[model samples]
Target: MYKLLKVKDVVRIPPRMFTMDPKEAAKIVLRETYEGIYDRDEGVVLAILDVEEISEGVIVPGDGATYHEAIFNVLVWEPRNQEVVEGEVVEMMPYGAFIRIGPMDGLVHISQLMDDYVVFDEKNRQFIGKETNRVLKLGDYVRARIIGVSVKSRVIRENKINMTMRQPGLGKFEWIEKEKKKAKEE
Candidate 1:
C-alpha cells in the first residue's frame, strides 16, 4: 500500500542553516522533521518525492529568521494490518528467527515457543516446535507483531521491539488446531 501525497507545509529555517540556499535549508530541515515519523493520514511518510514551489521567505522579528512555505510530494506506505506476511525467512540463531520482513529484520526470538516446545534440528539447520513440527530455518515465511520500535543499540540493530506470532491467526499451528478442535466439538 503505497501512496504519493501532496502536502503544503510551513517551515522555519534556523539561522544556523542559512549558509545554504533558503530552499535547500528548508528541504533538509523538512527531511529532518519528517524522517522516521508516521504521518497522520498518509500513513508512514517514506520519502519526500519532490518540492514543487517555494514561497518567498518570511522574516519574523523575534527569531529574525526565515519562514518558507512549499507544496511538496511525499511517498507513503501503510503498515501493520497484514498480520500474516509471506516473508523469506530471515536471520536465525539459537534464539528466535528474525522473520519479520522489512528494510531491516525485526527480531522474533524462538523463546515464544510455538504452542509447544521447540528444539533445534542440526541436520536441517532449523528449529521446530514439537507439537506439529512446524520448521523455521534461515529464510522461511513467519509472523511477528508490527508495533513500536526503540533504539537500545544496533547491537539490537540500534533499535528493536518485542514480537511473536502467538496471537489470532499468526501462530505456527495454532489456527489449525483451533479449527480442528472446534470442528469436532461442534
Candidate 2:
C-alpha cells in the first residue's frame, strides 16, 4: 500500500546524491516522512511509493516512528472498474507471454491470446490464433485488461492477465489483419 508523506528531516548520512559512489548502497532514516496524522492502529508495513514528493523507500512503521529505505515492495492499489490498457510484449514463455506496462509486467496466457483457439508456432516461436491466423510476437503493442494481480514481497506482478482480440477494436496491426485475410484466401 502507498502512503503520501513529507520528509520530517533529511538524514544527512553517507551516499549523498550526485556525489556518492555508485557502487555503495545508501542507508538512512528519512525523518519527517510522517506528519501530524500518524495512525497508531496501522502496523509497520512495507510499501512502494511512486509519489513525487517522497522518494522511493522501504517504509517501516514503529512506535512514534516510521522507518524508510530507498527500496521496498508493496501492493498495487488499482481501483475497480478499470479498463484495458496498452503494453509491449517483453518475452514469451511456454505458459504465456509477459508484457511490460510501466514498471510492472503482466502475463498473457495462451488461452487469453484471443477469443479463438491459439497455438504456438514453433518455426517463429510465436502464438497464433488458429481461426484468424493472427500472430503475436515480441514488441507487439497489445491491449489487455487487469484481470488479476499478485502482490508478493510488496511487488506487484500482473498474474492471470486475460486479453481478447475478438472484441471490436483489439489485436494486431492493419497489415497483420491483411495477412490474415490472405491466409483465409489460401
Candidate 3:
C-alpha cells in the first residue's frame, strides 16, 4: 500500500547548500537521505513529497552545516504478506523472474510464477508455461501475492521479497485477461 506520511525531522544543510533556498535544499537533502531506503516502521520511502514547514536555520559551532527542524510529507510503499501487488517483469533468470514492484524488485520463483509446469527459455529470456502456454517475459505486467519480505536483513544472497503468482487472480496480465473472458463467456 502507498501512503503519504507526515514526518518531522531535523535536516542538515551543508555549507555548499547554504546559498540555496532552505526549503529547496531541504528537499534535496531529504531525498538523498531517505529515498529508496526501507524502514521497519515506514517500509520503503519512495520520495520526499514536499516540505511542509522549515524552521529557522541554526548554525552549530564546529560543524560546517546548518540544521533546521522540518516537517515534510513522503510517499512510501508498505508491502504486507498475502497482499497482491502489480509489477512489471524487469529481468528473467533461470531460477525465477525479478518483478519491479514499487521501489524494489521482488523475486517470483519458477514454481510461483504460475500454476503449471514452467520452463525457462534462456536464449529468449522468458518463462514458458508448458500446460497453459502462458509466457512471462521482460516488460510484462504481472500480479503476484507477497509471500515473504525480509527488509531488515542485508545478506547478499537473500532475496528481499518472495512473491507468488500461482493463486487465482494472479500471474501475467494476459493470462488474467483470458481467465476473465473465459469466465464471462461461461
Candidate 4:
C-alpha cells in the first residue's frame, strides 16, 4: 500500500548523504509529490520511505558519488495497494526510468517496460526497442503499476512497472496518437 504525505524536517537521510545538510540538499523541495507507507510500528508522523532516492545506488553506497538524500514536502495521496497511478518521468537510466508519483518515485525496469526487448538509447537518453515505439522523454506523463514497497524506508520500489506505447491503455502521449488515428480512419 502507498500513502502520500507532506513531510518536513531532515527525515531519513541515507548514510551516504549525511555529509550535506538537510537544508541545502532539500532545495526546491522536490516540486513533485512523494509516496510512503503507513508505519504503524513507528507513527504516522514518520511515514516509512518506500522508494530509493536514486535508481542506481552503489553496492556499498557513497562509494564514489553517492545518491543525495531525497528531501521534499510530499503533497500526500490516499493509500492504495496494487493500483495503477499516473506520474511524470523525471529521469531515465540504462536499466529503467524514474517516475515521480506523488511523494515516491517508482522505477520501471527495462524488462518490465514492455513485452519486448528494451535497450537503452544513450544517444537520446530514452528507452527504445524494435517492436516498441513508445518513447518516454522527460516530463512525459506515464501510467505504471505499484509492484513493490519499502515500508521500512518510506520508499516505493516497483520492479514490475510495465510501460509500453503499444500496450492498451499505457505509454506517454498515447492519447495524441489515438486521436490522430481516429481522425485518419474517419
Candidate 5:
C-alpha cells in the first residue's frame, strides 16, 4: 500500500547549506536521508511528500552543522500477506505469469493460476484453461491473493511477492464477470 504519515526527526544542515532556507534545507535533507530506504520497521520509504514544520536551528560545535527538529509527511510502499489486489499480467511464460500488482510486482505460478488444467500457448502468448475455457494473456487483468512475502535485504530493488488465484473468489476479472452473469441466469 502507498500511504502518508507524519514523521518527526532532527534535520541536519551542514555549513555549505546554511545559506538555504531552513525548511527547504530540511526538505532536501529528508529526501536524501530516507527515500528508497527499506527499514524492517518502517517497511519502505518512497519519498518525502511535505515538510510541514522546522524548529529554529541550533549550531553544533565540531562540524559547524546546524540541527533543527522537523515534522513532515512521507509516502511509503509496503505489501504484506493475504492482500487481495488487482494486477496486470506483464509477462506470460510457459510456467506461469509475472504480474505487476498494487505497490509491488508479484508472480502467479503455474499451480496457483487456476483450479482447472491450464496450458500455455506459445503462438498466441496465452494461458488457456482446458475445462473452464478461460484465458489469460500478457495484457489481461487478474485479481489474486498474496500467499508469500520476503525481503532478504540483499539489495533495495523490490520485494518477493508470491500470488495465487486458485482460491475461491480469485482469478481473471473476465472469468469472474462471466460467473456473475451465469449466476443471475441460473
Candidate 6:
C-alpha cells in the first residue's frame, strides 16, 4: 500500500525563510505543498521522504520568494491490483459494504462478501450468509483483495477501490480464524 515515489516540482521559499539554507527552505516548502495531497495517478502523498536534488534558486523581479526546481521522494498509499488490505467496515448498503483502508475506502459487493448466498438484515445493518451464518457489520475488521479501482472521472481527488472477500484467507477476521481452525482439524 505504501511506496516510495520520485517526483520533481518547483518549490518557493519566502524571504522570511532566507535565513535558513536555500535547500532546507525548499524542502520545507515541498513538504507543506505536497504532503496530504493526492496526485492524479500517484495516489495519496503521505510524507516527503527526502530531497534528492535542488536546482539553482531564481529570484523573480516582482516576487521576493526564491523558486527552485527540486527532485524528491515521497511515501504514498497506492492500491495495486490484487493487493490484500486490512480494513474496518464503516458503512453497509443494500448492494455492498464500505471498508476504510488507511486514508481511503473500498467497496466490497454483497456477492464478494462470501461464497454462499447472502442476505441483508436491515434491522441489524449487516450481511449474513444463508448457510454459513457469516455476518459482516459495521466496525468489523476484514481482509480483502483489491479487485478494481476507479478514480473519479475528470476529478483526481476522489477514488473508488473495489475489493472482494470470497477468496481464501480473506473476509471477516472471525471467519478467517474459523476457517483456519477447521482446516487444522482436518
Error of 2 at 53 (Å): 9.9
- Cα-based lDDT for every prediction: 0.64, 0.49, 0.87, 0.53, 0.84, 0.88
TM, every model: 0.58, 0.51, 0.81, 0.49, 0.91, 0.85
Give the per-residue lDDT of model 4 (tens digit) for 47-135. Answer: 33332342323334445443434534432343244567778989888878878765556777777766567788899898766675756
Angstrom error at residue 8, model 4:
21
Question: Where in model 1 is the C-alpha error above 4 Å?
Answer: 1-45, 57-67, 76-86, 151-157, 172-186
Clashing pairs in 2: 8-31, 8-32, 9-31, 57-69, 58-69, 73-154, 74-154
lDDT of 5 at 29: 92
**On residues 2-36, what C-alpha lDDT tens digit does candidate 2 reach at each position?**
33332222222332342543212222222223221
Which ten contiguous residues of candidate 3 have the minimum total lDDT?
Answer: 150-159
Minimal lDDT window, size 10, model 2: 22-31
Task: Estimate the overall C-alpha local distance difference test score of candidate 3.
Answer: 0.87
- Compose the digit string of candidate 1's lDDT tens values, residues 1-186: 467888899988888877788767767777888856555454555787667788999998889678989888888754344334434456667776675455445556676636668887778778787776667677566555654444443232445544666555565443445546586795
Superposed by TM-score, candidate 3 places the C-alpha of residue 14 at a distance from the truth, in angstroms, of 4.0
Q: Which ten contiguous residues of candidate 1 have the minimum total lDDT?
A: 148-157
- Any idea what lDDT model 2 has? 0.49
Error of 2 at 186 (Å): 25
TM-score (C-alpha, index-matched) for candidate 6: 0.85
Tens digits of per-residue lDDT, candidate 5, 7-110, equal 99998887899889899889999998988777656567878998899998898677789999999998887667898888899888889898887545789998
Give residue 178's lDDT in candidate 2 (0 to 100): 64
The prediction achieving the highest TM-score against the true structure is: 5
| Candidate 4 Cα lDDT to native | 0.53
Could you give candidate 6's per-residue lDDT for residues 1-186 as a string of tens digits? 988888888888998998998777777888888787667688777888888899998999999888889999889888778999999999999999999986888999999999999999999999999998998999999999999987654333477789999999999999999989687995
Candidate with the larger TM-score of 2 and 4: 2
Clash count for each candidate, listed in order shown: 7, 7, 0, 19, 0, 0
lDDT of 3 by residue, 26-126 (tens): 99999989886676777877889999899998988999999999999999887788888999999888999889886678899998888789999989999
